[PDB]
């Protein structure tokens, strides 16, 4: 959407990695498990 996408880039310019934890995901097995990194994009205005 061009400039609105640039606005989204402004939205994407301030992110904080809040956690890196192990998922309680039902597809998990003994030889393959999901671990997540969480990125928070907060819009103050």
């Amino acid at each position: 959407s061009a400039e609105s996408k640039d606005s989204l880039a402004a939205l994407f310019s301030s992110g904080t990695i809040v956690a890196r934890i192990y998922c309680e995901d039902p597809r998990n097995t003994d030889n393959a498990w999901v671990e997540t990194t969480c990125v928070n994009f907060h819009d103050e205005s």
Partner: protein
């Protein structure tokens, strides 16, 4: 979103016509050739006072 980085330090290149000099023009150089760490063998500036 874009598909590249910023890739620009905002390097300054002054305008071609020197102010109040009666139309005397410099030797034009691109913004990716200004730093002294970079070689740039074709640098031939003009001496004007």
């Amino acid at each position: 979103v874009h598909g590249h980085t910023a890739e620009a330090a905002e390097w300054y290149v002054p305008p071609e016509e020197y102010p109040k000099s009666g139309g005397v023009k410099r030797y034009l150089i691109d913004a990716s050739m200004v730093p002294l760490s970079i070689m740039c063998p074709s640098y031939d500036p003009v001496e004007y006072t």
